[PDB]
Amino acid sequence: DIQLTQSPSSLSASVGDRVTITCRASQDINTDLSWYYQKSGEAPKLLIYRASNLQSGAPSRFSGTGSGTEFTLTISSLQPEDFITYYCQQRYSFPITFGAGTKVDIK
Amino acid sequence: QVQLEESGPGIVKPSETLSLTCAASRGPFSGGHFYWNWFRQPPGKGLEWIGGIYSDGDAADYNPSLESRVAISRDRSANRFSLKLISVTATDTAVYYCSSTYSWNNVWFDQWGQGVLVTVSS
Amino acid sequence: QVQLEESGPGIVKPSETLSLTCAASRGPFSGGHFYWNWFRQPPGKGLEWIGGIYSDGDAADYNPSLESRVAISRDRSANRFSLKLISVTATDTAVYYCSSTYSWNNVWFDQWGQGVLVTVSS
Amino acid sequence: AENLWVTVYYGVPVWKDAETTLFCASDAKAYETEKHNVWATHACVPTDPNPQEIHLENVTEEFNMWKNNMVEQMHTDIISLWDQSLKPCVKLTPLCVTLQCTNVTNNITDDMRGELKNCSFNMTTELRDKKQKVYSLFYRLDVVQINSNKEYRLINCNTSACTQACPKVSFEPIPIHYCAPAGFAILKCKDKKFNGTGPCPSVSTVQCTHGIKPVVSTQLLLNGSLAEEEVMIRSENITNNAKNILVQFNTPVQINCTRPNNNTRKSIRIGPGQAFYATGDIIGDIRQAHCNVSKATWNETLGKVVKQLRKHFGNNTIIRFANSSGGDLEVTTHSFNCGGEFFYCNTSGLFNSTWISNNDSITLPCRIKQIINMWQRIGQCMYAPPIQGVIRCVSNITGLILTRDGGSTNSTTETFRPGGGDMRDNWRSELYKYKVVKIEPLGVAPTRCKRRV
Amino acid sequence: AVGIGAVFLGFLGAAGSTMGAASMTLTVQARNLLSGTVWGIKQLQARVLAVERYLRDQQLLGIWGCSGKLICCTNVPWNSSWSNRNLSEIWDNMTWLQWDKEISNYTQIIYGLLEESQNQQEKNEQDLLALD
Amino acid sequence: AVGIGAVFLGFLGAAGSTMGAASMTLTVQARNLLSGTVWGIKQLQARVLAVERYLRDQQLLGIWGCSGKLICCTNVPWNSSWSNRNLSEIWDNMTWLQWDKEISNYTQIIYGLLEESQNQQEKNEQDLLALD
Amino acid sequence: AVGIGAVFLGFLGAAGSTMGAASMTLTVQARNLLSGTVWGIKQLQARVLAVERYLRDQQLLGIWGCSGKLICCTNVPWNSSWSNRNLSEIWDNMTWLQWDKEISNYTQIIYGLLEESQNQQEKNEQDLLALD
Ligand SMILES: *[C@@H]1O[C@H](CO)[C@@H](O[C@@H]2O[C@H](CO)[C@@H](O[C@@H]3O[C@H](CO[C@H]4O[C@H](CO)[C@@H](O)[C@H](O)[C@@H]4O)[C@@H](O)[C@H](O[C@H]4O[C@H](CO)[C@@H](O)[C@H](O)[C@@H]4O[C@H]4O[C@H](CO)[C@@H](O)[C@H](O)[C@@H]4O)[C@@H]3O)[C@H](O)[C@H]2NC(C)=O)[C@H](O)[C@H]1NC(C)=O
Ligand SMILES: *[C@@H]1O[C@H](CO)[C@@H](O[C@@H]2O[C@H](CO)[C@@H](O[C@@H]3O[C@H](CO[C@H]4O[C@H](CO)[C@@H](O)[C@H](O)[C@@H]4O)[C@@H](O)[C@H](O[C@H]4O[C@H](CO)[C@@H](O)[C@H](O)[C@@H]4O)[C@@H]3O)[C@H](O)[C@H]2NC(C)=O)[C@H](O)[C@H]1NC(C)=O
Ligand SMILES: *[C@@H]1O[C@H](CO)[C@@H](O[C@@H]2O[C@H](CO)[C@@H](O[C@@H]3O[C@H](CO)[C@@H](O)[C@H](O[C@H]4O[C@H](CO)[C@@H](O)[C@H](O)[C@@H]4O)[C@@H]3O)[C@H](O)[C@H]2NC(C)=O)[C@H](O)[C@H]1NC(C)=O
Ligand SMILES: *[C@@H]1O[C@H](CO)[C@@H](O[C@@H]2O[C@H](CO)[C@@H](O[C@@H]3O[C@H](CO[C@H]4O[C@H](CO)[C@@H](O)[C@H](O)[C@@H]4O)[C@@H](O)[C@H](O)[C@@H]3O)[C@H](O)[C@H]2NC(C)=O)[C@H](O)[C@H]1NC(C)=O
Ligand SMILES: *[C@@H]1O[C@H](CO)[C@@H](O[C@@H]2O[C@H](CO)[C@@H](O[C@@H]3O[C@H](CO[C@H]4O[C@H](CO)[C@@H](O)[C@H](O)[C@@H]4O)[C@@H](O)[C@H](O)[C@@H]3O)[C@H](O)[C@H]2NC(C)=O)[C@H](O)[C@H]1NC(C)=O
Ligand SMILES: *[C@@H]1O[C@H](CO)[C@@H](O[C@@H]2O[C@H](CO)[C@@H](O[C@@H]3O[C@H](CO[C@H]4O[C@H](CO)[C@@H](O)[C@H](O)[C@@H]4O)[C@@H](O)[C@H](O)[C@@H]3O)[C@H](O)[C@H]2NC(C)=O)[C@H](O)[C@H]1NC(C)=O
Ligand SMILES: *[C@@H]1O[C@H](CO)[C@@H](O[C@@H]2O[C@H](CO)[C@@H](O[C@@H]3O[C@H](CO)[C@@H](O)[C@H](O)[C@@H]3O)[C@H](O)[C@H]2NC(C)=O)[C@H](O)[C@H]1NC(C)=O
Ligand SMILES: *[C@@H]1O[C@H](CO)[C@@H](O[C@@H]2O[C@H](CO)[C@@H](O[C@@H]3O[C@H](CO)[C@@H](O)[C@H](O)[C@@H]3O)[C@H](O)[C@H]2NC(C)=O)[C@H](O)[C@H]1NC(C)=O
Ligand SMILES: *[C@@H]1O[C@H](CO)[C@@H](O[C@@H]2O[C@H](CO)[C@@H](O[C@@H]3O[C@H](CO)[C@@H](O)[C@H](O)[C@@H]3O)[C@H](O)[C@H]2NC(C)=O)[C@H](O)[C@H]1NC(C)=O
Ligand SMILES: *[C@@H]1O[C@H](CO)[C@@H](O[C@@H]2O[C@H](CO)[C@@H](O[C@@H]3O[C@H](CO)[C@@H](O)[C@H](O)[C@@H]3O)[C@H](O)[C@H]2NC(C)=O)[C@H](O)[C@H]1NC(C)=O
Ligand SMILES: *[C@@H]1O[C@H](CO)[C@@H](O[C@@H]2O[C@H](CO)[C@@H](O[C@@H]3O[C@H](CO)[C@@H](O)[C@H](O)[C@@H]3O)[C@H](O)[C@H]2NC(C)=O)[C@H](O)[C@H]1NC(C)=O
Ligand SMILES: *[C@@H]1O[C@H](CO)[C@@H](O[C@@H]2O[C@H](CO)[C@@H](O[C@@H]3O[C@H](CO)[C@@H](O)[C@H](O)[C@@H]3O)[C@H](O)[C@H]2NC(C)=O)[C@H](O)[C@H]1NC(C)=O
Ligand SMILES: *[C@@H]1O[C@H](CO)[C@@H](O[C@@H]2O[C@H](CO)[C@@H](O)[C@H](O)[C@H]2NC(C)=O)[C@H](O)[C@H]1NC(C)=O
Ligand SMILES: *[C@@H]1O[C@H](CO)[C@@H](O)[C@H](O)[C@H]1NC(C)=O
Ligand SMILES: *[C@@H]1O[C@H](CO)[C@@H](O)[C@H](O)[C@H]1NC(C)=O
Ligand SMILES: *[C@@H]1O[C@H](CO)[C@@H](O)[C@H](O)[C@H]1NC(C)=O
């Protein structure tokens, strides 16, 4: 199984601070990875698709980069609505796995 | 524009059979393949993948850890798809979601819904 | 967009053979007839016409006064055309030009270039 | 706000009933050799390996099997293609010569007395001035006596000259698809209880229809489709007895049709490059060609048909089955093709029963005719060449063509007999669910927008 | 390869949807309108007939000053005599087939009105531009 | 009669030139696209096939909102994934054939993107105009 | 039913009228241009020939930047060499046939000039828009 590791596991930052979340895959998956955003009480929603094509309707402050076994989600300016949990999901061959999850909290 | 609703028993006794059903919708799209997938989100941890089924085929894919305990079927006349989990344990208490992912040209949409709570207790 | 360059000996002895060569260019135009013409501009007087040759044919036209002394040939592989003048006299000292005139629909362009100086002396 | 203008919409999803010319399409597997066949497959466009079928949600469409142009169109197409296939083959006009015929006492069974006749005659060879005396075997239904000596002539000699079919050409039916051209659509009714006409709420659109095998048969529907729900009955006017009744089976009935005679093919040189294939001496015993069906399966199918018919003719009605009343051999017998040989089977043993309001196999005899006048046409006959060895075929009976006898008042009983004679009824069993429509992309609508002045 | 497919807006399968909802799939059907010696001639005749039908439709669109546009507003007023109704129940409740059935009677007069309005607009625009 | 001829921009003879230089001769080839019982039927079939090809190309151009224009800008962004390169080396060094060879892989996705963008633009323009 | 009829602008019956007066009936003739195994093939060939003629005319109109418009002004100046005359006697005294007879000599040069002007205008517009 392809194991996805997210760093940091939990992060605390203020509004407007630039934050970075990194996901590592146990094996090469090329560019077939995406990131989803979720808050407790609501179903997860896609944030960045293919790690290089911004999902329609999502804020432009979220950027996806990287390929292979290293992917990066960067938020230039944090927002009150951005204090959510971010997951990395590999869109590679089965089985399908999701990242550990990074929690963003207000400091 | 596909909205998926979950139904099933709120509380299932341990080692019993847990049956959930969800309504499949196609939206404005007229032809293609829809991958109706069942998931679970146990409290205190991240989401997990249970299985999935194609719209144009009865072939079913299941998580390797739940191959012998998870089955998924569908009925096109009612446009529903059901998930049956046997030998339910305390770890099966989760928020079960029925999701569908569109596959339009180089977009890869995804819709999940709201899910249903399932608790395993005696 | 055709630019024509002239080459040949700067000084030619009297009664010798004067050979000049020019590079033919077609420009953006793909099909048609190009009239590669040789002229001369002796110092202190106006321009004079020597001869001309078609692009699609080997037929050559020459000035009546220089019919027996002027010949013009061409080679398509190198896209060059040469002018040979025999029995060169002191009056042949001139600025020789190789010119091409386009014939697009009711426009009649014309390009000349820069020419080359030829002096006849002993 | 209230003021609104007219706006034009193109490529609109609307249609109307219309008739056009569809085109044939065949599977790519037929391209792998097998280029010689009656139903030209090299001339048909290759089919889509994954045909698209688009379901029309919230759409109800009115279908009418009987007033369908596809059935007539494809019947005409089949007739024309058959004529075109038979055109390059040998013209069998010299066979119209006096024949000296005798009986065949070669270990014939009691039921095959006089069916086969040994006929000798003169015929032109490759050289016109020379002639050859040759003998062959002909079935009794192919020669007529002309009046000591016994002289017979081919039955067609006073009608037309037959065209012997090319032996390399295969009579085996192949799946065929009909696709509408650009600007037209084909609608399929997915309703499993559809009775052939009326509204249909479950509809889909398909570029090309499913594979259709143009099987030629009478009183039976061989190798046809099967209804998903149960046995179904379709009729233009069920009350009117003058209209045929099409019955579709839920499950097929296996039928084994065999000609056990070990036939021999003999080549005769009529002229320059003209070869005539005749039936030579039969090796071994001679037995009547016959077809077998399962008695229990046929009985259960007839019971289901009786129940579904009582659903239309009242519960307390006696349902009787009788054989064909009479007429020409084409309609009075189940006529079809098996491995290149034409069979005419006497079905009196399959429609002989009565039903009140409350490992054995059925064997029926069959006759062989080498001269065929199909499509009910006169003046165009084909001479079917004989085929060496025994002939055996296994087929599926999936439908029936029935006719109701006119009952006086309410005689609390009804009799149904096998009928047909029109291949259009046979075709209608497969194209019932399909309709052709024409698109009208233009459309005017009211919209508040107003074009700039 | 995670279970994705095509999910493409195909044939008239969206006809059963509402007016505005079905307006999404006009172009796919417009493109489909050009999908592509006794039988080849017949199929060629069918192809040529489809070609003439599409070209006549394009000519009709161009005559009304709407060439190259799936949706084109016009200056012809919408007379209430044909079908009054109201905007809300048209684009959200009625399908395209029902609308075509309802308005099938007065199509020719609409075509003529659009023709005359477009011709008048073209002449007025030519005169106005020549004025400048 | 002083040696003049035709010197007309003819057939694809300019294909070997650069991108921008070859853009001069697009219309002549566009016009050439319509140059004009067992053999006449075949030549008629060839003519009809050419007609359908050109008409399908025109329909594709119209669907993207570029009908009647040899050159038509569009609102679809140029993703660098297909071929990054840069503007200077494209229109002055590479020929049309090389560009077609390079970009032959992703043509269909470009067509779909142009289709979707044109449809969205048409609907937005209709809504905006109805607002006024 | 008070004696009314059709009174429709039909075929070329208005050709004998003046230039401007006959400009009314251009669209009806434009629509008429598409009115609709040894004889069917010949009639199909006639239909296909008419189709190619109309499509070539439409292509010529589009090449000059006048697609979808019966009347389209252009940037080519009207040289007096062809036929000086004056505006008043042209659109009020001379018929279309006489004008075609008079100007039949220089049609090709007009077509080429319109082609070149439209191409130059398209390139200039593209450069100007890319500038913004
Ligand atoms: C309803 O549908 C069923 C199911 O398809 C159908 O039954 C099938 O009928 C066809 C047509 O008669 C049968 O095909 C023929 O079968 C035999 C034997 O060949 C097959 O079987 C053997 C062993 O099983 C295989 O090794 C072999 O590959 C075949 O599968 C032959 O009679 C036929 O072959 C001759 O005819 C062909 C004509 O197309 C030639 O291509 C072929 O080369 C053969 O001709 C040669 O031999 C002849 C005899 O020696 C000679 O006269 C020729 O000149 C030439 O040399 C043909 O393959 C098929 O097997 C049946 N299927 C089953 C399962 O039984 C029903 O007929 C159909 N019902 C109706 C009413 O249409
Ligand atoms: C349909 O009817 C035709 C005739 O119209 C029949 O064809 C004839 O069939 C008979 C019976 O088989 C044939 O006679 C046999 O032919 C063979 C060849 O014989 C050769 O030798 C004899 C002299 O020995 C010559 O006269 C003859 O021309 C041949 O050169 C042999 O199989 C037979 O000979 C053997 O049997 C006889 C029987 O008494 C003995 O006397 C012989 O010594 C020998 O053992 C016999 O002659 C006849 O030739 C066929 N004629 C033709 C023209 O083909 C068909 O058989 C019939 N079909 C059916 C199904 O009934
Ligand atoms: C299709 O097949 C059916 C039968 O499957 C057939 O009907 C039968 O026709 C025959 C005539 O061909 C009828 O007459 C019979 O003919 C012979 C010779 O006599 C015998 O089989 C029968 O005689 C026996 O039975 C008689 C009555 O029981 C006895 O008196 C007699 O001693 C013999 O035992 C009989 O006379 C025969 O009756 C019918 N069968 C039935 C069941 O009706 C039909 O003709 C065939 N159709 C075609 C077009 O060939
Ligand atoms: C075939 O016809 C069906 C019946 O009309 C169509 O179903 C409709 O589907 C549309 C979306 O495509 C729905 O619109 C949504 O509806 C609700 C609004 O709430 C109302 O409806 C819900 C459920 O019926 C109910 O619980 C509420 O009390 C309201 O009455 C919201 O989800 C959205 O805002 C949106 O408006 C229609 O409601 C729905 N109609 C029904 C179910 O009757 C179907 O789409 C048609 N098929 C096609 C292919 O067009
Ligand atoms: C086939 O390929 C040939 C090789 O690329 C093309 O030749 C080119 O032709 C263009 C005009 O069509 C020339 O552009 C002009 O070049 C010079 C710029 O100066 C530079 O080149 C000259 C001569 O090579 C040299 O002396 C200088 O030092 C510079 O290096 C100027 O005249 C103009 O400004 C203009 O830019 C190309 O230079 C020329 N390339 C060469 C000769 O390598 C030929 O046109 C192609 N054929 C077709 C039909 O397109
Ligand atoms: C065929 O040619 C005929 C001869 O030219 C055309 O007749 C012309 O018809 C137009 C209208 O279509 C008339 O224009 C009107 O004329 C008068 C102007 O007054 C002058 O003419 C009248 C009568 O001739 C005369 O009494 C006066 O003194 C003037 O000389 C007014 O009614 C209007 O303002 C308008 O301009 C032409 O005058 C008329 N010409 C004649 C009769 O010579 C005929 O229309 C042509 N047919 C077609 C189908 O086009
Ligand atoms: C094929 O052609 C042959 C050869 O011509 C035909 O045989 C001939 O048949 C006739 C009519 O039966 C014979 O005439 C009769 O012959 C005998 C002996 O004379 C007698 O019965 C009568 O007096 C009369 O003349 C004729 O002799 C005979 N020829 C030969 C050479 O045998 C034959 O009839 C034709 N048809 C067939 C089906 O074979
Ligand atoms: C196949 O099914 C269709 C319906 O899907 C049948 O058509 C229906 O036939 C019945 C009579 O059998 C019609 O009812 C009659 O209609 C009129 C008006 O009321 C009148 O004559 C009688 O009072 C009676 O109600 C019914 O209207 C008709 N439906 C349609 C939509 O046409 C058809 O008969 C069936 N065919 C067979 C062979 O069973
Ligand atoms: C389906 O077939 C039935 C049965 O033939 C048709 O009903 C029949 O309709 C005809 C008229 O079309 C009736 O004839 C007339 O009947 C009465 C009483 O005699 C009288 O008005 C006239 O003198 C004339 O004879 C006929 O009686 C009637 N049959 C029955 C049994 O009711 C029915 O019309 C057919 N349906 C369709 C859709 O074609
Ligand atoms: C169709 O059904 C009929 C009737 O059952 C079959 O005829 C029967 O075929 C069997 C098997 O060949 C025959 O048995 C054999 O008969 C002889 C004489 O005893 C001998 O070869 C063997 O010892 C064996 O018993 C049987 O006699 C024959 N007739 C009847 C009345 O049963 C026929 O074969 C079936 N056809 C097919 C294609 O299945
Ligand atoms: C028509 O002919 C077919 C064969 O071409 C017959 O099917 C065959 O029927 C025999 C029995 O008559 C079957 O043999 C038995 O099968 C099973 C095991 O497969 C078992 O009961 C016995 O051990 C024995 O082997 C044979 O399998 C079967 N073949 C097929 C392909 O189905 C059919 O019965 C004939 N139909 C009629 C109406 O006579
Ligand atoms: C059509 O169906 C009828 C009615 O079932 C059949 O008639 C009956 O056929 C059986 C079987 O042949 C006859 O039984 C036999 O009758 C005589 C003595 O009566 C004798 O051959 C046998 O001992 C045997 O019992 C039965 O009599 C006969 N009934 C009548 C009233 O004729 C008929 O055979 C069926 N036809 C076909 C072609 O299946
Ligand atoms: C029909 O008769 C022919 C006569 O030729 C049989 O073919 C022969 O079969 C035997 C036995 O297998 C072989 O030894 C011979 O070589 C065959 N002869 C030829 C010329 O091929 C044929 O088998 C018979 N058919 C049946 C079904 O019994
Ligand atoms: C349309 O008009 C009808 C008839 O007056 C009315 O009942 C309905 O509410 C109207 N729909 C609107 C205002 O959306
Ligand atoms: C295009 O990019 C290449 C690769 O970086 C570079 O070498 C070249 O100079 C660029 N061309 C320009 C800037 O005109
Ligand atoms: C047109 O020019 C001619 C020739 O000079 C002149 O006679 C005539 O009056 C002019 N027409 C006008 C000015 O309307």
Side-chain angles (χ1 to χ4, degrees), chain F residues 104-122:
Chain F
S104 47
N105 281 42
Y106 329 120
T107 314
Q108 289 295 307
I109 82 171
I110 303 306
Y111 288 9
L113 264 177
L114 297 165
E115 201 285 347
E116 186 217 14
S117 170
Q118 167 64 3
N119 213 346
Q120 164 267 3
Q121 165 209 304
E122 201 86 60

Side-chain angles (χ1 to χ4, degrees), chain C residues 2-6 22-23 35-42 46-51 81 95-102 109-116:
Chain C
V2 170
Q3 37 269 66
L4 307 161
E5 318 310 306
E6 287 86 342
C22 179
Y35 196 33
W36 306 310
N37 297 359
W38 273 103
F39 286 74
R40 60 181 179 191
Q41 184 181 214
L47 66 148
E48 295 174 350
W49 174 42
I50 290 184
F81 53 102
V95 196
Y96 291 74
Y97 297 90
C98 59
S99 165
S100 158
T101 65
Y102 314 152
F109 308 87
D110 161 57
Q111 325 304 126
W112 272 61
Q114 98 289 353
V116 55

Side-chain angles (χ1 to χ4, degrees), chain D residues 6 11 73 444 449-451, chain E residues 29 64 73-75 99 121:
Chain D
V6 61
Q73 191 270 354
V444 307
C449 163
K450 179 206 167 11
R451 208 209 282 179
Chain E
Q29 303 147 213
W64 310 334
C73 300
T74 59
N75 279 352
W99 179 255
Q121 165 209 304

Side-chain angles (χ1 to χ4, degrees), chain A residues 53, chain B residues 105-107, chain F residues 60 63-66 72-82 106-122:
Chain A
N53 191 7
Chain B
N105 40 18
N106 328 297
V107 179
Chain F
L60 254 53
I63 287 176
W64 310 334
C66 300
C72 156
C73 300
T74 59
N75 279 352
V76 174
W78 182 262
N79 231 17
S80 180
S81 34
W82 315 315
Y106 329 120
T107 314
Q108 289 295 307
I109 82 171
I110 303 306
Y111 288 9
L113 264 177
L114 297 165
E115 201 285 347
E116 186 217 14
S117 170
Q118 167 64 3
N119 213 346
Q120 164 267 3
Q121 165 209 304
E122 201 86 60

Side-chain angles (χ1 to χ4, degrees), chain E residues 37-38 41 44-45 48-49 51-52 55-56 58-60 62-67 111 115 118-119 122-123 125-126 129, chain G residues 20 23-25 27-28 30-37 40-41 43-44 47-48 51 54-55 67-71 73:
Chain E
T37 71
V38 175
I41 173 164
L44 192 146
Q45 167 167 350
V48 169
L49 186 58
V51 153
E52 301 146 89
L55 191 130
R56 183 196 314 284
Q58 282 300 296
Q59 178 182 51
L60 254 53
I63 287 176
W64 310 334
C66 300
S67 191
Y111 288 9
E115 201 285 347
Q118 167 64 3
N119 213 346
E122 201 86 60
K123 184 52 61 53
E125 192 295 344
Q126 190 255 33
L129 206 164
Chain G
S23 40
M24 301 315 78
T25 89
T27 89
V28 52
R31 154 191 321 151
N32 154 255
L33 292 193
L34 273 285
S35 147
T37 71
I41 173 164
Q43 65 90 54
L44 192 146
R47 293 211 320 240
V48 169
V51 153
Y54 170 93
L55 191 130
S67 191
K69 296 159 71 29
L70 291 321
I71 307 304
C73 300

Side-chain angles (χ1 to χ4, degrees), chain D residues 108-116 139 261 286-289:
Chain D
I108 46 149
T109 58
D110 279 346
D111 51 358
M112 289 219 88
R113 291 182 184 280
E115 281 292 304
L116 276 158
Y139 298 97
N261 290 349
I286 289 166
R287 278 149 309 161
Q288 209 180 18

